[PDB]
Design a protein around this motif. Structure first.
Motif, mmCIF file in Angstrom:
data_model
loop_
_atom_site.group_PDB
_atom_site.id
_atom_site.type_symbol
_atom_site.label_atom_id
_atom_site.label_comp_id
_atom_site.label_asym_id
_atom_site.label_seq_id
_atom_site.Cartn_x
_atom_site.Cartn_y
_atom_site.Cartn_z
ATOM 1 N N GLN A 28 0.820 -1.204 0.000
ATOM 2 C CA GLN A 28 0.000 0.000 0.000
ATOM 3 C C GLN A 28 0.859 1.261 0.000
ATOM 4 O OE1 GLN A 28 -3.453 2.524 0.275
ATOM 5 N NE2 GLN A 28 -2.317 1.014 -0.934
ATOM 6 N N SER A 29 1.313 1.663 -1.185
ATOM 7 C CA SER A 29 2.155 2.845 -1.323
ATOM 8 C C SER A 29 1.576 3.887 -2.280
ATOM 9 C CB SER A 29 3.550 2.426 -1.791
ATOM 10 O OG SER A 29 3.466 1.552 -2.904
ATOM 11 N N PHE A 30 2.124 5.096 -2.220
ATOM 12 C CA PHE A 30 1.665 6.182 -3.076
ATOM 13 C C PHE A 30 2.801 6.862 -3.852
ATOM 14 C CE2 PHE A 30 -2.737 6.579 -1.567
ATOM 15 C CZ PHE A 30 -2.687 5.938 -0.338
ATOM 16 N N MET A 31 2.439 7.474 -4.979
ATOM 17 C CA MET A 31 3.365 8.213 -5.827
ATOM 18 C C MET A 31 2.764 9.586 -5.991
ATOM 19 S SD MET A 31 4.177 5.523 -8.937
ATOM 20 C CE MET A 31 5.322 6.578 -9.762
ATOM 21 N N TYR A 32 3.460 10.607 -5.514
ATOM 22 C CA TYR A 32 2.947 11.953 -5.668
ATOM 23 C C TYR A 32 3.782 12.725 -6.669
ATOM 24 C CZ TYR A 32 0.806 10.580 -1.263
ATOM 25 O OH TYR A 32 0.109 9.889 -0.303
ATOM 26 N N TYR A 33 3.117 13.564 -7.448
ATOM 27 C CA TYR A 33 3.795 14.393 -8.423
ATOM 28 C C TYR A 33 3.565 15.808 -7.939
ATOM 29 C CZ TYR A 33 3.710 10.145 -11.237
ATOM 30 O OH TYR A 33 3.895 8.849 -11.665
ATOM 31 N N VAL A 34 4.645 16.591 -7.862
ATOM 32 C CA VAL A 34 4.593 17.980 -7.415
ATOM 33 C C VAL A 34 4.994 18.917 -8.530
ATOM 34 C CG1 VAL A 34 5.012 17.394 -5.035
ATOM 35 C CG2 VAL A 34 6.953 17.820 -6.503
ATOM 36 N N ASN A 35 4.708 20.209 -8.373
ATOM 37 C CA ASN A 35 5.048 21.131 -9.434
ATOM 38 C C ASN A 35 6.423 21.827 -9.399
ATOM 39 O OD1 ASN A 35 3.986 22.548 -7.277
ATOM 40 N ND2 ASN A 35 2.353 23.534 -8.476
ATOM 41 N N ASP A 36 7.422 21.135 -8.865
ATOM 42 C CA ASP A 36 8.809 21.630 -8.910
ATOM 43 C C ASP A 36 9.640 20.339 -8.898
ATOM 44 O OD1 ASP A 36 11.261 22.975 -8.737
ATOM 45 O OD2 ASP A 36 10.459 24.439 -7.292
ATOM 46 N N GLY A 37 10.813 20.324 -9.527
ATOM 47 C CA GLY A 37 11.602 19.097 -9.528
ATOM 48 C C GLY A 37 13.103 19.272 -9.800
ATOM 49 N N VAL A 38 13.780 18.197 -10.210
ATOM 50 C CA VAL A 38 15.224 18.252 -10.474
ATOM 51 C C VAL A 38 15.692 19.268 -11.513
ATOM 52 C CG1 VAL A 38 15.473 15.881 -9.754
ATOM 53 C CG2 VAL A 38 15.249 16.453 -12.198
ATOM 54 N N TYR A 39 14.797 19.733 -12.382
ATOM 55 C CA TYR A 39 15.176 20.761 -13.351
ATOM 56 C C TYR A 39 14.893 22.128 -12.746
ATOM 57 C CZ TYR A 39 15.666 17.283 -17.033
ATOM 58 O OH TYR A 39 16.059 16.196 -17.776
ATOM 59 N N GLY A 40 14.158 22.127 -11.642
ATOM 60 C CA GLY A 40 13.846 23.385 -10.993
ATOM 61 C C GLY A 40 14.644 23.484 -9.709
ATOM 62 N N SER A 41 13.942 23.787 -8.621
ATOM 63 C CA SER A 41 14.573 23.935 -7.323
ATOM 64 C C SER A 41 15.343 22.734 -6.862
ATOM 65 C CB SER A 41 13.528 24.306 -6.271
ATOM 66 O OG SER A 41 12.891 25.499 -6.663
ATOM 67 N N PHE A 42 14.946 21.540 -7.293
ATOM 68 C CA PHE A 42 15.674 20.383 -6.823
ATOM 69 C C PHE A 42 16.866 19.968 -7.682
ATOM 70 C CE2 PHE A 42 12.811 19.454 -3.285
ATOM 71 C CZ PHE A 42 11.603 19.998 -3.716
ATOM 72 N N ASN A 43 17.351 20.884 -8.513
ATOM 73 C CA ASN A 43 18.536 20.598 -9.323
ATOM 74 C C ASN A 43 19.671 20.317 -8.326
ATOM 75 O OD1 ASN A 43 20.704 23.036 -9.309
ATOM 76 N ND2 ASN A 43 18.657 23.931 -9.068
ATOM 77 N N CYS A 44 19.517 20.869 -7.120
ATOM 78 C CA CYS A 44 20.474 20.707 -6.027
ATOM 79 C C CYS A 44 20.723 19.238 -5.704
ATOM 80 C CB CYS A 44 19.975 21.460 -4.776
ATOM 81 S SG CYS A 44 18.422 20.839 -4.037
ATOM 82 N N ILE A 45 19.749 18.388 -6.004
ATOM 83 C CA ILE A 45 19.893 16.958 -5.769
ATOM 84 C C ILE A 45 20.954 16.366 -6.704
ATOM 85 C CG2 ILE A 45 18.852 14.717 -6.104
ATOM 86 C CD1 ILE A 45 16.129 15.997 -5.300
ATOM 87 N N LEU A 46 21.014 16.881 -7.931
ATOM 88 C CA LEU A 46 21.982 16.376 -8.903
ATOM 89 C C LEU A 46 23.309 17.133 -8.843
ATOM 90 C CD1 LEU A 46 20.209 14.285 -10.035
ATOM 91 C CD2 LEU A 46 18.929 16.440 -10.003
ATOM 92 N N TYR A 47 23.239 18.452 -8.717
ATOM 93 C CA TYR A 47 24.442 19.275 -8.694
ATOM 94 C C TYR A 47 25.124 19.466 -7.342
ATOM 95 C CZ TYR A 47 23.294 21.001 -13.474
ATOM 96 O OH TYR A 47 23.030 21.137 -14.826
#
Ligand SMILES: Cc1ncc(COP(=O)(O)O)c(CNCCCCN)c1O
Ligand SMILES: Cc1ncc(COP(=O)(O)O)c(CNCCCCN)c1O
Lengths: 381, 378
Positions: free
Chosen positions: B268-287
């Protein structure tokens, strides 16, 4: 802007006289289109705008008669902005923000994709009459695409939501080393397509997605893929006036049309050299981190007979030690102020750029051919 | 702009009642500076603009009297734009494009770094009187100590005014000893410079200090190690100026990101999609190798059930993923997820891939007397 010499490289040399810049051959796009019609005559291309949204690139594909696959309210607005009718637009994003769905409806865009029931609940409340295309998985698969064994249930729920399901789509991606993936996807698509007709839906669209090579060099050639696709199509979706086959090629159309020219701004000698150039992983080369791209530096300088070559590294402008473009490639000794060229830089390059460290992305220049005078005049405005 | 509220959370709640947005507490910056002055009284901070160049962030740091570390003509233009004098600016980029060096010169910026002879050859031709700072290694930047004598000898031939040494240990330290070692190594180079007759009066200890008071290696422990090394190798002297180039230290915890759940899938798990990501504010996750933790902005309910969940960005990229498996309470489309400690290397590395626009920035300022007036009136 637009310059002459009807060869991207002569125009580039002629230009060279220290900011980085692109030379985009709009004429290469025309040629790619001629090859598409010849190898996939049954498939209507809806260009994936996300790949490269330059205005000249969109104006060119528009005059060639392609459609456009848009992923957000911004891309729809951009495409409608150059006068492209909503019927030539597909909203192929499976998980859309409600306000963006509302924008599409208000703009006349009616074909959208979906891959789960939750999305249908949104469409029901926001764009009830939208023609929905069900995107199935090709085992990117974790993120999008309903599994075939879930499609019956999904379609049942769609019927309950009174959703006008009109097709099936899939995307194999660009990481295939075998065209057989397309054949298996087209087969699965037939199975889901029939399930829809069975449940009373008006199934008339098959969307085969993107992932086609954009550089006539890659291992798996476009021609071999078109052949495997055509055979699967002949077998599972014979021609019929109620059926329309479409695709969402992105890199195929622009990968090779853009050549990037960067300037060697600094140099270190250690027998090897380290060159620093004025574009990098936070700019045009973000494709290296996000698109798994591999680049090859080419000296702009005309070669000299027996030049010595040395193991070299090429680095971006940025303070980041990870901002490295080339680790160890053989180049002749370069001088600060000289230029390095990078071909096949048209896909997933300019669209993923950031202004980190305050550096500005390279300006784009254009050379064009294969288009009418009136169309060029529109591209130049 | 400025939001009504006594807290970041309070301001968030107010506003919320679906585009993603930032709430930056300029007050958290003021407090970081107070802590800096307390733990590193001998070191003048020159804020690394590249970390986050938000106009309010810069104006605040400027009013607090900090200096600025700039990396391009664009950043110099920006800092000079808010009225900061050229003397409070250090052009800390070792490998500069010639037209950019020329720009700094014409802007009155004279302190620049370098780490090899080739960069000096450029300076001699474009900014002959610049005050040059030699950056040593702690493979992209930094001269090895063993090579500094030769470099200094060449600088003399180029008639370069070498005035100091700098280094940057980076954020990847599990031990503060790295700062001690770098300070010791800097002493060796400082002495070689004096010996060759250069006027060595600047030690730049760079950045790398934590910006989130939770990290393993605490700022105070680092400050202590730095202060002891400084006392041992660089005793107080009116001719000696010690500076630093902190970046994330000042802004990491000042920004909170609020993103909207735009789509959900159940498995019983969920997948959420949000309106910001790795190309946006979360580029910090890759860089920037960042790890984030989603926080329901929704006030908790007693014993809500929690499920393993993933969070995804709004993009077509299957790699645009934020969280792999994190326990959250069942979320509904339209509900908000918050991400704290999102001020460093986030807004600066954003791209508009797929056409999505970067989150807008709103400001609040807590825990401060009506100094709030001064900062809001800039
Ligand atoms: C749904 C969908 N449709 C088309 C495309 C275009 O793919 P391409 O290989 O022909 O350019 C995509 C692409 N998705 C992700 C590209 C990431 C590049 N790093 C797509 O998702
Ligand atoms: C020379 C130099 N000076 C300061 C900083 C700021 O570092 P910080 O940890 O205190 O913010 C840097 C950092 N440069 C690269 C940051 C990459 C983040 N992904 C620096 O090089």
């Amino acid at each position: 802007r637009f310059l002459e010499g009807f060869n991207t490289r002569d125009a580039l040399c002629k230009k060279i006289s220290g900011d980085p810049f692109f030379v985009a051959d709009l004429g290469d796009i025309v040629r790619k289109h001629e090859t598409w019609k010849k190898c996939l005559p049954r498939v209507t291309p809806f260009y994936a705008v996300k790949c490269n949204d330059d205005w000249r690139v969109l104006g060119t594909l528009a005059a060639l008669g392609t459609g456009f696959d848009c992923a957000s309210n911004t891309e729809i607005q951009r495409v409608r902005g150059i006068g492209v009718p909503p019927e030539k637009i597909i909203y192929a994003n499976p998980c859309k923000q409600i306000s963006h769905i509302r924008y599409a409806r208000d703009s006349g865009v009616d074909v959208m994709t979906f891959d789960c029931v939750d999305e249908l609940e949104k469409v029901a409340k926001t764009h009830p009459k939208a023609k929905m295309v069900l995107r199935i998985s090709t085992d990117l698969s974790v993120k999008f695409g309903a599994k075939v064994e879930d499609c019956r249930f999904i379609l049942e729920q769609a019927k309950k939501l009174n959703i006008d399901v009109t097709g099936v789509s899939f995307h194999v991606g660009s990481g295939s080393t075998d065209a057989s993936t397309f054949a298996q996807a087209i087969s699965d698509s037939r199975f889901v397509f029939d399930m829809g007709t069975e449940l009373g839906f008006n199934m008339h669209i098959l969307d085969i997605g993107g992932g086609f090579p954009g550089t006539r060099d890659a291992p798996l050639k476009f021609e071999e893929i078109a052949g495997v696709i055509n055979n699967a199509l002949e077998k599972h979706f014979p021609p019929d006036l109620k059926l329309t086959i479409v695709a969402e090629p992105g890199r195929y159309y622009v990968a090779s049309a853009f050549t990037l020219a960067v300037n060697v701004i600094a140099k270190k000698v250690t027998q090897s050299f380290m060159y620093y150039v004025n574009d990098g992983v936070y700019g045009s080369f973000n494709c290296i981190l996000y698109d798994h791209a591999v680049v090859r530096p080419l000296p702009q300088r005309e070669p000299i007979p027996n030049e010595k070559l040395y193991p070299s590294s090429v680095w971006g402008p940025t303070c980041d030690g990870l901002d490295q473009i080339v680790e160890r490639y053989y180049l002749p000794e370069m001088q600060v102020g000289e230029w390095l060229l990078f071909e096949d830089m048209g896909a997933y390059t300019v669209v993923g750029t950031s202004s980190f460290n305050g550096f500005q992305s390279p300006t784009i220049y254009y050379v064009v051919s294969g288009l009418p005078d009136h169309v060029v005049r529109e591209l130049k405005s």
